[PDB]
Design an enzyme around this catalytic site. Structure first.
Site, PDB file in Angstrom:
ATOM      1  N   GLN A   2      42.719  57.445  57.237  1.00 34.27           N
ATOM      2  CA  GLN A   2      43.966  57.443  56.431  1.00 34.27           C
ATOM      3  C   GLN A   2      45.289  57.394  57.224  1.00 34.27           C
ATOM      4  O   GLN A   2      45.310  57.761  58.396  1.00 34.27           O
ATOM      5  CB  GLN A   2      43.996  58.617  55.465  1.00 34.27           C
ATOM      6  CG  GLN A   2      43.000  58.511  54.334  1.00 34.27           C
ATOM      7  CD  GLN A   2      42.909  59.806  53.577  1.00 34.27           C
ATOM      8  OE1 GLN A   2      43.846  60.219  52.881  1.00 34.27           O
ATOM      9  NE2 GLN A   2      41.762  60.460  53.670  1.00 34.27           N
ATOM     10  N   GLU A   3      46.387  56.949  56.547  1.00 34.84           N
ATOM     11  CA  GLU A   3      47.761  56.700  57.030  1.00 34.84           C
ATOM     12  C   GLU A   3      47.759  55.935  58.415  1.00 34.84           C
ATOM     13  O   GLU A   3      48.419  56.376  59.369  1.00 34.84           O
ATOM     14  CB  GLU A   3      48.673  57.972  57.008  1.00 34.84           C
ATOM     15  CG  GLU A   3      49.249  58.329  55.626  1.00 34.84           C
ATOM     16  CD  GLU A   3      50.752  58.227  55.351  1.00 34.84           C
ATOM     17  OE1 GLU A   3      51.541  58.851  56.095  1.00 34.84           O
ATOM     18  OE2 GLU A   3      51.131  57.612  54.325  1.00 34.84           O
ATOM     19  N   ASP A   4      46.971  54.787  58.481  1.00 34.13           N
ATOM     20  CA  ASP A   4      46.755  53.762  59.555  1.00 34.13           C
ATOM     21  C   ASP A   4      45.517  53.945  60.527  1.00 34.13           C
ATOM     22  O   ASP A   4      45.115  52.930  61.108  1.00 34.13           O
ATOM     23  CB  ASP A   4      48.017  53.510  60.423  1.00 34.13           C
ATOM     24  CG  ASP A   4      48.977  52.448  59.908  1.00 34.13           C
ATOM     25  OD1 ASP A   4      49.322  52.488  58.706  1.00 34.13           O
ATOM     26  OD2 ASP A   4      49.447  51.623  60.727  1.00 34.13           O
ATOM     27  N   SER A   5      44.924  55.174  60.711  1.00 31.56           N
ATOM     28  CA  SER A   5      43.790  55.433  61.648  1.00 31.56           C
ATOM     29  C   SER A   5      42.459  54.707  61.300  1.00 31.56           C
ATOM     30  O   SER A   5      42.434  53.934  60.337  1.00 31.56           O
ATOM     31  CB  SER A   5      43.538  56.929  61.848  1.00 31.56           C
ATOM     32  OG  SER A   5      43.456  57.696  60.661  1.00 31.56           O
TER      33      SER A   5
END
Ligand SMILES: [Mg+2]
Ligand SMILES: [Zn+2]
Ligand SMILES: [Zn+2]
Lengths: 134, 84, 107, 1415
Positions: A2-5
């Site tokens: 989540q949030e780009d990873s």
């Protein structure tokens, strides 16, 4: 992820997925004073001055160097230089505290002045970690 | 010089700040081997014991609430309402 | 209170401090056309007495300093004929209260 | 903390009396004689002489010898020396007041030129401000440059006063770097005002005289501004950084001291021996040079005096100047111990308050717990593990303070611990630490977590805390700080804990939301469509950490036991919660599964997403924190994540190119929408070519086409993407994202599946960077759609080479402004927070600071704790005065207005009662009182205001926590209700005071809340609507009471820092009928700008005529500035020597008319444009009489009238006139105003949609006329017949406060800032801005948020030096013998003390009496 990873298959990293290398060099010279007073390239041990480093001198041979192929640790000496003053101060250069690895190439030449130049290499196998950038 | 305990425009409730510093000074002192005014009922963490001290409201601390003009008012831990 | 059309001589206005304690106020016709005070933006300004002013400092524990100070030239502080020291109790309204008491000291 | 005890008493630093070093004192205060620059060694023989180093200062080389003080190196503070200067020297910075005082004091007797005989000098001598007393004296005495031997008395002029002697003239002092230049006059002789000559006069200056200036005969005299004694700084200020042993290492400061020492004994040689005089002034000026050099090199004196290395030399000024320059990087900011910086990764298993801490970091970070019998035994296990096993100890500090470094000790296993010892144990599982993601611009950016020692080298964190920290798992780097004081870890755990800040005080909304996977999963599960079967359900139910182990009834038990996606989500939701939302497509049956209904921690209908599980004011998040708890709700973030994500893992989600493609014909229809607007482009293109274009008001013809051509291109850019927007089915993986809100917007769909659109830099549709064409691939003069930068393709289709390059330039701008504003904003945060630092909430329940200066008399004009406030609704303002009457009026005399005995048990007997209806009269009358009150504070009707204590939620809970059956009547008496509120109204307190004003501004404070209180708890609404018992009613009154006294702001709360940390923080996020777009607009208002980038005056029409179209049609040309330049085509000069006859044939008859019904030979004829004239509607007679009355009787006018086609105004006048007439036309066009007020330009008309209460009471819409203008000069524009000189507003806030009082200034400034909060739509509670707005007001006028606003006022010498100007500020602290309170933040900050902030404000003691009781 989540949030780009992102998640990664270790059972794939194991084969060669984003497996890499990283090679660091080290520089030092047999520095002259003019009055034919030169810093000594060997394995110094206490005696007269005792102004020495704390690492492992014990790994280096008697040409003031580890021959390539030995496993370097952390803060252990890679370069053995003794500073004569008017005996054994010392200006030996060790492995970068952070790093680890194996010695790759131990190069020694002469400069434009003919001062015993050293070039040691630290061969590390950087493998995909839990927070590496991709 | 100060002000007396009757005549208090200062909120009769403890401030979240006063809670943190009483429960902290008791955390410090109680870890500093200081006398424990509550029964140590299974409690062993200094800071924690200090919390079961404000519960049993048997903390000997008194708060000096200074007025920005100069003078001040006093309130014990017992004296402060804990609706925090 | 002198109400001039264009201006007054600076030769003449030096005769303003001339008759104390009596204070001489001077206003040009220009700002008087519209009532500067009757504006949406400016709330009530109240001339607070010697005792009213003292009481403010005695209860609200303030000093001649600490107070949120007011301009002398404030179109209000001349519409009220304010002088230095006088307190102006202002009843402004609030988005989160309805009313709030602000106090100013004239300079 | 210093090392090794001293019998010296320990204490606070209560004052810092700044002053000057008396060259008398410098000598005494010296242990060393400092005479030669042979530093250390006595001729290489490794020691030190009576030179630069240890002639008695302090030795280097791990040795004592520090003149009896010895104390090694640490515990040995530096010991100062001295050096007598060979000639006095002008102290580099105090050179200012040296020139100044010299222009005031008689350079003969040492007496001020002017005195108590000059009235304005008297006015000055009276000014009680130490440097403003100087300010006037300087301005005053510099003038009279002759001291009076005699001068007339204040009584009679023939009566003189011999006051002070000497009538000798003063010089005209001007700088020359190191020596002043005088001047007296026959022929001007300028004197070399030398240091020696100057100092002399300064000694003589009367005590009372330097006292009437900014000086002091105890701390700082003006005779010490000139140095004779230079204090030699000790070596820990100018170190000896030796290479190995037999090599030097002196700091550049030691150099400039040696270079002064040379220059001292040089001036000594020339002096003591053969005098060379005008060669002595060289060794003098070099000593004078190097003494001024060693302090400051980076000055106005061109030579930076480079040391032989090209280095300016480390000036003691450059060592203290901003960021990493002591004050701002070594004092206000520091590099600290017990710290850790690591890479970040996401986590669906950690609680909101838990932190990822790798083993190595836990084994590296130590905490000292005190050997007490509670821990001791377990610490002794830590003690036999050291730093290899996770729980171990690094060092063990004895009772004495001897570090038993476990790692290498011989008794390292033995270690027999005693009490009072300190074991330095590793930081471990569930311990407190300050986790932080830079920059720390927010209170919320630096929060406290709970250690959970994980393997794998990354700092992991709960995914709901991804938003308050500014997190993105792209390898962000975060800090960690380990508290040591059991008092300090109490400070984290009680104010810094994550569960506390769930609700954002900064904007009265919660600042932690469920994101991405949890944001899309929860919506994909909370559908009517989704279900789960027993095996997978049981896994989901178990996954709730605190589940009752109770299997809920499956909603469907028919040919499959099935559990709805909502009946399983309801499990995590805590029992007792009440949440009612509702939307457009909601009907309680909600066909669209719309709205949200959650009755007692169970979902009824609606879909959970951003409007529930999202960081919003109404959101389930907010509700649960107030209605249930903080370490309760933070659990709920966890519970949900764990369960939603377990279901998401098994449901699965993916987004591929399949989503970017719209259904077949929709994709065709898109190139129809762009094609029809491309036709709407050529329309204007053909219209503009033949000049048929009706150019609008305040618009160029070139602009007119472009502004409209853009309109249809973007009107179609939007509707092109709209096609594919709803065409992409319920199944579209990208629609699904934006559905919940998870990530994305409609614009995205538009630019990916339909069309991109117009690209522009500085707003300008990519213009002609070449000759009239866009790119060299284009034709000269191509204003075409694709030409000026329009993209018809979507990212899917692939952009053309051109459609791609135009996309590069427009994107280019979006990278520059990022770098620019992110940095300017950085400075904007600094300023706000350095200004609002000291400011907080106090015990008087007042807003004060660093002195006690009041900002607000109750914080936030109300007195509540920022977050406790939820947007509440005032039902009393709304409805017609008739709807209100039905809802509220109770009339127990009329049969048709009596509460029926179905509402209250008394209903049948309470009718027809005298005093009982008399009671109710006060009730309804107080509501009508409240009605107009609220209709006066807000005349826009709006009731949705930020108000503390959600009264809705309390009753919500009452109806289901009392199971009130709205079947049988309520028990209550009319006496119970009306009065029950009348008593509650009293116990709701802010200022606890017992006097007049403290009781008064208190009533004022809780007026609004009381109006809401009266709206809900009104007798009818209570029994008719609510049907609540006395029991429930008493609960409603009880719960409101304490919830309110909790709402009271906590004295200490750094309200100021907080106001700024809620303004400065969201200012960064600003990505920006025409003004300045938020970001530059803010720097105009904060910096207080009178030179406005967009000045605009807005006038509302005169009271009566609101909708009168024609009224604005008159005022418009009556306010708009018209020039003769506007109406004139060409002004010519002819030679017409005859007054009557005109040789001009184009005027030949024109004259004969306006003539019949001495004068100049030079004619001034000028042609007029008929349209430009009949534009501001004009007559030649208007123009004619205008000019006539401009020049008057010296110039005569004739003209052709509007009938005559040759639009001419001929003019003459009364030796030499060719140049003199050519002179006139210059003033004529530029200065002759014709129509309207000057400066006030582009007068444009607006039919402003107003809000007025209707003839029935209904708040209704009123379309009224408003003249919005590009011009500001209100001064007279207010005095106009056709305007409302009450509604009249302007952009120039300065021009508001100027003409309409200071309390209207606070107003224009606030309105001007709130319309910067809406410049990015975002909210900030009134209180944060209204504090700053009050900061630049409580002065008496307007003050900038810079070093000449807040940093130049009253606050202590250290509170101001901490920002913008430093060494500088501190220099006037010295000379004017200033003082520090040690009362503000910055004051205690420097000293490393507990400042009076929150926990530091109050002091704690122990009453032997209360202490003795317990035993
Ligand atoms: Mg970032
Ligand atoms: Zn010493
Ligand atoms: Zn004199």
């Amino acid at each position: 992820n989540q949030e780009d990873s992102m998640i990664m298959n270790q059972s794939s990293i194991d084969r060669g997925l984003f497996r890499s290398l990283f090679f660091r060099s080290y520089m030092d010279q047999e520095k002259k004073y003019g009055m034919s007073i030169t810093e000594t390239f060997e394995k110094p041990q206490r005696t007269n001055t005792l102004r020495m480093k704390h690492g492992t001198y014990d790994k280096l041979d008697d040409d003031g160097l580890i021959a390539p192929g030995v496993r370097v640790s952390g803060e252990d000496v890679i370069i053995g230089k003794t500073t004569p003053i008017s005996s054994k101060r010392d200006a030996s250069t060790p492995l970068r505290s952070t790093e680890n690895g194996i010695v790759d190439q131990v190069l020694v030449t002469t400069n434009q002045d003919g001062l015993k130049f050293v070039k040691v290499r630290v061969r590390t196998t950087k493998i995909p970690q839990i927070g590496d950038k991709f | 010089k100060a002000i007396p305990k009757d005549q208090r425009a200062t909120t009769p409730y403890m401030t979240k700040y006063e809670r943190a510093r009483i429960l902290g000074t008791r955390a410090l002192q109680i870890s500093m081997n200081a006398p424990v005014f509550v029964d140590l009922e299974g409690e062993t963490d200094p800071l924690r014991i200090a919390m079961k001290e404000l519960a049993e409201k048997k903390i000997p601390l008194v708060i000096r609430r200074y007025l920005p003009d100069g003078s001040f008012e006093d309130w014990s831990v017992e004296e402060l309402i804990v609706d925090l | 209170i002198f109400v001039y059309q264009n201006n007054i001589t600076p030769s003449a206005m030096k005769l303003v401090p001339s008759i104390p304690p009596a204070t001489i106020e001077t206003f040009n016709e220009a700002a008087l056309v519209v009532n500067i005070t009757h504006h949406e933006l400016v709330p009530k300004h109240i001339r607070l007495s010697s005792d009213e002013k003292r009481e403010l400092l005695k209860r609200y524990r303030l000093k001649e300093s600490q107070l949120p100070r007011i301009q002398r030239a404030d179109p209000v502080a001349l519409y009220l004929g304010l002088k230095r020291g006088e307190v102006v109790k202002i009843i402004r309204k609030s988005e989160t209260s309805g009313r709030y008491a602000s106090y100013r000291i004239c300079m | 903390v210093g090392q090794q005890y001293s019998s010296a008493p320990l204490r606070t630093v209560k004052e810092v009396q700044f002053g000057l070093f008396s060259p008398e004192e410098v000598r005494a205060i010296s242990v060393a004689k400092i005479r030669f620059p042979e530093t250390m060694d006595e001729t290489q023989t490794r020691a030190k002489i009576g030179g630069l180093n240890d002639p008695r200062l302090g030795s280097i080389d791990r040795n004592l010898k520090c003149q009896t003080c010895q104390e090694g190196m640490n515990e040995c503070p530096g010991h100062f020396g001295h050096i007598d200067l060979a000639k006095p020297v002008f102290h580099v910075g105090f050179i200012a007041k040296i020139k100044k005082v010299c222009e005031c004091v008689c350079m003969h007797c040492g007496k001020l030129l002017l005195d108590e005989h000059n009235e304005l000098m008297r006015q000055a001598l009276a000014i009680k401000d130490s440097k403003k007393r100087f300010a006037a004296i300087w301005t005053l005495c510099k003038t009279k440059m002759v001291c009076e031997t005699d001068v007339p008395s204040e009584d009679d002029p023939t009566q003189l006063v011999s006051r002070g002697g000497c009538g000798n003239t003063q010089p005209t002092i001007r700088k020359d770097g190191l020596k002043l230049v005088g001047s007296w006059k026959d022929e001007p002789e300028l004197r070399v005002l030398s240091t020696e000559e100057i100092l002399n006069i300064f000694k003589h200056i009367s005590v009372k005289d330097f006292t009437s200036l900014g000086f002091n005969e105890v701390f700082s005299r003006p005779e010490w501004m000139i140095l004779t004694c230079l204090p030699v700084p000790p070596p820990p200020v100018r170190p000896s950084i030796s290479f190995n042993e037999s090599q030097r290492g002196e700091d550049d400061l030691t150099f400039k001291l040696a270079d002064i020492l040379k220059a001292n004994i040089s001036l000594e040689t020339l002096e003591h021996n053969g005098a060379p005089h005008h060669a002595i002034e060289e060794a003098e000026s070099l000593l004078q040079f190097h003494v001024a050099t060693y302090m400051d090199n980076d000055i106005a004196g061109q030579p930076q005096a480079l040391q032989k290395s090209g280095r300016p030399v480390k000036s003691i000024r450059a060592r203290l100047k901003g960021k990493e320059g002591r004050i701002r990087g070594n004092l206000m900011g520091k590099r600290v111990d017990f710290s850790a910086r690591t890479v970040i990764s996401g986590d669906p298993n950690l609680e909101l308050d838990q932190v990822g801490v790798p083993k190595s970091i836990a084994k590296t970070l130590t905490y000292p717990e005190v050997v007490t019998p509670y821990n001791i035994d377990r610490l002794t296990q830590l003690v036999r593990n050291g730093p290899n096993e996770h729980p171990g100890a690094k060092y063990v500090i004895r009772d004495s303070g001897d570090r038993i470094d476990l790692r290498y000790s011989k008794r390292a296993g033995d270690i027999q611990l005693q009490y009072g010892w300190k074991v330095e144990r590793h930081i471990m599982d569930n311990d407190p630490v300050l986790f932080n993601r830079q920059p720390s611009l927010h209170k919320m950016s630096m929060m406290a977590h709970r250690v959970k020692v994980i393997p794998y080298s990354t700092f992991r964190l709960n995914l709901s805390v991804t938003s308050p920290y500014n997190a993105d798992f792209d390898g962000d780097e975060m800090n960690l700080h380990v508290p040591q004081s059991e008092e300090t870890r109490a400070e984290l755990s009680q104010l810094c804990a994550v569960p506390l800040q769930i609700v954002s005080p900064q904007s009265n909304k919660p600042c932690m939301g469920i994101v991405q996977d949890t944001l899309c999963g929860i919506r994909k599960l909370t559908l009517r469509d989704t279900f789960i079967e027993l095996d997978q359900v049981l896994n989901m139910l178990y996954w709730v950490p605190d589940w009752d182990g109770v299997i809920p009834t499956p909603a469907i038990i028919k040919p499959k036991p099935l559990w709805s996606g909502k009946q399983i989500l309801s499990v995590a939701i805590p029992n007792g919660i009440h949440l009612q939302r509702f939307d457009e497509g909601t009907t309680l049956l909600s066909p669209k599964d719309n709205g949200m209904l959650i009755i007692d921690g169970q979902i009824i209908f609606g879909v959970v997403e951003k409007k529930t599980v999202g960081s919003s004011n109404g959101g389930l998040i907010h509700v649960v924190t107030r209605e249930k708890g903080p370490q309760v709700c933070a659990k709920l973030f966890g519970n949900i994540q764990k369960v939603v994500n377990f279901w998401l893992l098994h449901n699965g989600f993916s987004t591929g190119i399949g989503d970017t493609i719209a259904d077949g014909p929709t994709m065709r229809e898109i190139t129809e929408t762009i094609a029809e607007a491309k036709k709407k482009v050529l329309d204007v293109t053909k219209e503009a070519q033949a000049n048929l274009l009706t150019a609008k008001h305040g618009m160029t013809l070139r602009e007119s086409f472009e502004d409209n051509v853009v309109r249809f291109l973007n009107e179609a850019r939007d509707k092109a993407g709209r096609l594919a927007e709803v065409n992409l089915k319920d199944l579209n993986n990208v629609k699904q994202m934006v559905m919940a809100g998870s990530k994305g917007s409609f614009i995205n769909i538009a630019q990916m599946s339909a069309c991109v659109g117009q690209q522009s830099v500085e707003g300008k549709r990519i213009a002609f960077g070449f000759v009239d064409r866009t790119l060299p691939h284009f034709s000269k003069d191509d204003y075409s759609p694709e030409s000026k930068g329009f993209v018809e393709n979507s990212y899917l289709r692939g952009l053309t080479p051109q459609e791609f390059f135009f996309h590069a330039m427009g994107g280019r701008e979006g990278l520059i402004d990022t770098a620019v504003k992110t940095a300017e904003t950085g400075y904007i945060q600094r300023r706000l927070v350095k200004a609002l630092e000291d400011i907080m909430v106090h015990y008087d329940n007042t807003t004060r600071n660093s002195l006690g200066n009041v900002i607000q008399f109750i914080y936030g004009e109300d007195g509540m704790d920022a977050a406790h406030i939820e947007k509440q609704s005032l039902d009393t303002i709304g409805g017609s005065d008739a709807a209100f009457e039905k809802r509220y009026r109770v009339d127990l005399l009329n049969t048709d207005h009596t509460l029926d005995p179905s509402l209250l048990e008394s209903g049948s007997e309470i009718l027809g009662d005298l005093k009982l209806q008399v009671l109710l009269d006060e009730e309804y009358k107080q509501l009508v009182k409240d009605r107009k009150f609220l209709r006066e504070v807000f005349v826009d009707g709006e009731a949705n205001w930020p108000l503390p204590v959600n009264i809705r939620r309390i009753i919500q809970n009452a109806q289901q926590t009392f199971h009130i059956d709205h079947t049988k009547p309520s028990d209550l008496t009319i006496k119970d209700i009306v009065l029950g509120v009348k008593d509650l109204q009293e116990n709701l307190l802010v200022l606890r005071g017992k006097n007049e004003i403290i009781q008064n501004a208190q009533r004022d404070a809780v007026t609004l809340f009381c109006c809401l209180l009266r709206s809900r708890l009104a007798t009818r609404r209570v029994l008719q609507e609510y049907r609540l018992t006395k029991q429930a009613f008493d609960w409603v009154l009880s719960n409101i009471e304490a919830q309110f006294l909790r709402s009271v702001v906590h004295p200490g709360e750094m309200v100021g820092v907080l106001a700024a940390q809620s303004i400065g923080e969201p200012a960064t996020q600003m990505t920006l009928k025409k003004v300045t777009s938020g970001v530059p607009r803010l720097k105009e208002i904060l910096n207080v700008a009178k030179n406005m980038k967009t000045p605009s005056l807005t006038v509302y029409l005169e009271p009566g005529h609101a909708a009168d179209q024609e009224q604005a049609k008159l005022i418009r040309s009556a306010i708009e500035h018209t020039t003769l330049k506007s109406v004139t085509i060409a002004s010519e000069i002819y030679y017409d020597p005859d007054p009557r006859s005109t040789v001009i044939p184009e005027d030949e008859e024109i004259i004969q008319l306006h003539f019949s019904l001495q004068q100049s030979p030079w004619l001034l004829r000028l042609e007029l444009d008929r349209a430009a004239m009949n534009d501001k509607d004009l007559t030649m007679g208007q123009v004619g009489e205008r000019i006539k009355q401009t020049f008057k009787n010296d110039l005569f006018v004739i003209w052709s009238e509007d009938n005559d086609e040759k639009l001419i105004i001929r003019c003459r006048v009364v030796a030499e006139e060719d140049h003199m007439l050519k002179k006139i036309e210059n003033t004529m066009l530029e200065n002759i105003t014709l129509r309207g007020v000057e400066n006030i330009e582009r007068v444009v008309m607006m039919k402003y949609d107003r809000k007025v209460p209707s003839p029935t009471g209904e708040y209704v819409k009123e379309p009224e006329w408003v003249l919005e203008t590009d011009g500001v000069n209100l001064s007279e524009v207010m005095t106009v017949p056709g305007i409302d000189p009450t509604r009249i507003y302007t952009n120039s806030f300065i021009d508001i406060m100027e003409v309409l009082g200071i309390e209207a200034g606070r107003a224009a400034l606030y309105k001007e800032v709130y319309n910067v909060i809406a410049s990015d739509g975002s909210y900030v509670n009134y209180r944060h801005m209204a504090l700053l707005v009050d900061v630049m007001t409580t002065q008496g006028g307007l003050t900038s948020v810079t070093r000449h606003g807040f940093n130049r006022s009253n606050t202590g010498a250290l509170m101001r030096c901490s920002f913008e100007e430093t060494v500088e500020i501190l220099f006037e602290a010295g000379a004017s013998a200033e003082l520090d309170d040690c009362r503000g933040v910055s004051e205690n900050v420097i000293l490393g003390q507990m400042a009076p902030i929150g926990t530091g404000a109050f002091d704690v003691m122990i009453d032997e009496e209360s202490l003795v009781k317990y035993m």
